[PDB]
Each structure stands twice: as C-alpha cells, then as structure tokens.
C-alpha cells in the first residue's frame, strides 16, 4: 500500500490513526507503535488545564523570569515583566509551539505525573509524559518515556475536543487555538482538499520525529480526528514535512 | 480465522463491528456488508422518538383496534380495549420486540421515510427504513430496502445512547429500557464475562437473519459498542443464538 511506499521513498517510519467520527470509518498504519510525541503533547496539556479552570478561571496572573525561559520562546520572550495569563500561554503553547508556555502551563497542572494520571483517567493508558521541554524530545528508540501512539493521541485529542470531557466553552477554545496554529502549514493542512477547516498541533524531536495531530472538517459532515507521526533511525536525522502532507492525502482519500 | 470458523461452524455469513469507546481499538468483520436489520431498528426508532418527544409527551394515550395489530404483538394484543401510552409502547417495543408497538411508534415519527431522514441527519448514510412490521423482514439478497450494516447500526446506537443526539435523562431512559430487554439472554448477553452490564436489542428476519446490537460495559472501563449481524443462504433457514454469542466471545477476547 501507499503508506509503505512513503516510508521507503522518505527513509522514515510512519504512524497513522484517523477516525470518521460520523461513520467510525478508520484508517490505520502502525496505529500502536510508539513515537516520541514531542510538542503534540501540548494540546493534551491544555486539554487538562481547561479541565481544571473555567473560562472565567483562565485569567490568572502568572509570572516568570529570564531563567524560567528555555530553548525556543517566540512569545514568552516578549512578556518577561509584562507577564502572561493562562489563556495567553495556552495560546502560545498551542499557536507557536512555545516551549516555555508548555513548561509554565505544566507546573499549573502539577507536572508530567499529574498530566499522566489525568490522561490515565479519561482512558489513555498509553501516553507517557515524564519531562518538561526541551528535554522531553530526548528519546532513544525503544524507550517509552515521553512517547505515545497514533491511536492514543488522536483519542486523547478527540476526548478533549469532541467528547464530554470538556464543557462547550472550554472546548471551543481548544478547537479555536488549534484551528489557528501557525506551525503546520506544510503538515496535515497541506494534505486536505481546498477549504476544509483544520485544527492541528505539530511536533519535532530527535531521531527525525515530525508529528501532527488534527481534527479536520469537510464542508459536509462529521469531523475526522487524526494523528500522523513519523520517525527515522539516525539520531540527528532530519525530517521532511512532505512525509505528513502525503500521508494525510492517503488518509483523506481512504475516507 | 476465528470469525470465519464460526461462519462455517454455523453456516452463516457474519457481520461484526465493535468499538472500545475509550481506546478506539476496534473489532471488524464484513463490517460494511448489508444485512436485513429486523427489530434492531426498534432501538433506533425509539432513539428518534426520544429526539422529538418530551417525557410528559410520553404519557399520551395511543388507542388502536384489533386491525392495527400485526403478527407478533405480545403486549399490544392485551390492551386493544384500553390503549397504551407511548412510554408503554416504547418499553413493549424495546423489551419484548413488540411489532404493533413499533408500528404505532414508527407512525408517531412520520413513518419509515422520516426515520431515514433523522438517521441521515445524525450521519447514518447506510440504514434504509422503508416498511412497517412485519413486511420490513421480507428482504431478498441484493435488496437494500430495510437493510443497514454492523458499522452503521452500531454507530447509530452509539449516537443515541452515548453521544450528544439526546440529553442525559433520555440516554439513561433508552439505556434502562435496553438494559432490561427480555429477548437476548442467549446472544450478546451469553457471550460476555460475568459482571459486564449489557443493554442490547435483538432481531430476526428471513434468510435466517439473527442480529443483536448493544452497548456493553465491563466492571471498570469505558463502554463497548457492538453490532453482531448474521444471515444465511436459504430463505426458510432457522437461526442459532449460539452463533451471536460465540462471536461476541471473539470480540471480548480480541478487545
Ligand atoms: N516547532 C517545530 C517543532 C517543535 O519544536 O516541536 C519546529 C521544528 O523543530 O522543526 C514545529 O514545526 O512544530
Ligand atoms: N422480534 C424478534 C425478531 C425480530 O422480528 O426482529 C422475534 C424472535 O426472536 O423470533 C426478537 O424477539 O428478537
């Protein structure tokens, strides 16, 4: 099949799960193999934040200094003294793959163990968060620390975005933030036909991991949730986004 | 494999889909082949009913005559001279597979063709109501009148019992009626381990059709959605409920 080809063509390993929520038509390809989830754990993080705070609640004055920053801070670097509220960090984590927002947010929710135990509670026995950013990308092959599967990660995304795990308000926020991500214009979004709406969170990590997790709406129907993950066998290996775009089109077509 | 062994052991074609609504792990087998659906449609019919009617609405007295009665009305034949409320006809419909009850309910929602359109609305592009009881069961092979599939019956059952297509009080009510069905102790019920709660809705048509659809809940863990359909090649063929129960055993093990 066309997924096996793309893996040869790109010298890379792919993981796919998509679900037509309106038909329970699926599309699977290594759906339970582990990949370092990378920055995609960011959506699920905000997933549990929103689960602990009303829309009203998410305006908390939260502060941080120069030292709290880490290795890539496109938004948090503008607002040292300024300070940013949960909303705006959730915006930054989600819209710009801000490493520091993720970290500061993660403290709010009580560290990677809590995240884990919360992920345990909704029904994800797979996603294994252990560390903050950037270290969390430090994943060697066969380790489970900070990995999940395509299945696990769509399902967690679905539960937050589209199930009863979140009230209307809080959920339209997630969808929104994600609908307007800046980072995935060459991932999932480049693989769906002109003018279907897309909410996505992307990731990159060592061993050439490039990941995208999305809900995507046609013009007519129920949304497809989907994770597309990939990796390579060289630690310092580089990724091709066009791996994901392509994968997605094979997903769309199949559905 | 496992399912095809059953198919040859019992000399019947099998239609199985199942979704672990916590993991999206699935069991499928001919999940998109079409079967005459028989009384299984009864649960979707009450799903639709509950979409349109309030609870107090369910107190209305429907009267009927010995003429309004068909060829298997185990409760409705006993109340011709006093009528029954809609609540009482739902019950009788669901728990005893009461045909007249279906025919009067089917009639309260706009007849087969309004039953199609509501099922199109939720996203069931497969299920195809056309007739009332008992003529709906008169389906020859090739025919798509009065057929649906495992993926579609199951998805549809899910929509009503679990999703957002009804409010929670109405879920609970559909679920309760379905938890107390009298007619399937020997099928899905008979194929799951002790302490697994089942709400299910059997059926049987010609060509030896024997179906069962259910939400089934383990002691701890998320609900599992479950259609098991079956048919055979000869038209006057008897069914065996051992087929549907042994097949469920395969689902529970696989799952
Ligand atoms: N921000 C990145 C990945 C990440 O930092 O998790 C850019 C990259 O590192 O290639 C993205 O495109 O999501
Ligand atoms: N209503 C039936 C089958 C049907 O008409 O769909 C009666 C029977 O078992 O013969 C049922 O009880 O499931």
UniProtKB/TrEMBL annotation, chains A, B:
Keywords: Antibiotic resistance, Hydrolase, Signal
Reaction(s) the record says it catalyses: a beta-lactam + H2O = a substituted beta-amino acid
GO molecular function, one term: beta-lactamase activity
EC number, UniProt record: 3.5.2.6
Domain Beta-lactamase class A catalytic: 15-229
UniProt key word Phosphoprotein: no
GO biological process: beta-lactam antibiotic catabolic process; response to antibiotic
Alphabetized PROSITE patterns for the sequence: BETA_LACTAMASE_A
SUPFAM superfamilies for this protein: beta-lactamase/transpeptidase-like
Top EC class of this enzyme: hydrolase
Keyword Signal listed: yes
PANTHER family named among the record's database cross-references: BETA-LACTAMASE (PTHR35333), BETA-LACTAMASE-TYPE TRANSPEPTIDASE FOLD CONTAINING PROTEIN (PTHR35333:SF3)
Similarity comment text for this entry: Belongs to the class-A beta-lactamase family.
NCBIfam families: bla_class_A, classA_firm
Protein name: Beta-lactamase
Source species of the chain: Bacillus licheniformis
């Amino acid at each position: 099949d066309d997924f096996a080809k793309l893996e040869e063509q790109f010298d890379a390993k792919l993981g796919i799960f998509a679900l037509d929520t309106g038909t329970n038509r699926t599309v699977t390809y290594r759906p339970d193999e582990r990949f370092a989830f990378a920055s995609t754990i960011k959506a699920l993080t905000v997933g549990v934040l929103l689960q602990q705070k009303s829309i009203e609640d998410l305006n908390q004055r939260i502060t941080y200094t120069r030292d709290d920053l880490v290795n890539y801070n496109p938004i948090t670097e503008k607002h040292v003294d300024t300070g940013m509220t949960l909303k705006e960090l959730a915006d930054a984590s989600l819209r710009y793959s801000d490493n520091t927002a993720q970290n500061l947010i993660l403290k709010q929710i009580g560290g990677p163990e809590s995240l884990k135990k919360e992920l345990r509670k909704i029904g994800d026995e797979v996603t294994n968060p252990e560390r903050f950013e950037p270290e969390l990308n430090e994943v060697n092959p066969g380790e489970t620390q900070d990995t999940s599967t395509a299945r696990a990660l769509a399902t967690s995304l679905q539960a937050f975005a589209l199930e009863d795990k979140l009230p209307s308000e809080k959920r339209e926020l997630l969808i929104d933030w994600m609908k307007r991500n800046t980072t995935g214009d060459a991932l999932i979004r480049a693989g769906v036909p002109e003018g279907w709406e897309v909410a996505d969170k992307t990731g990159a990590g060592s061993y050439g991991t490039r990941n995208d997790i999305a809900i995507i709406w046609p013009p007519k129907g129920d949304p497809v949730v989907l994770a597309v993950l990939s990796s390579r066998d060289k630690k310092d290996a580089k990724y091709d986004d066009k791996l994901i775009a392509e994968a997605t089109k094979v997903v769309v077509k199949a559905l």
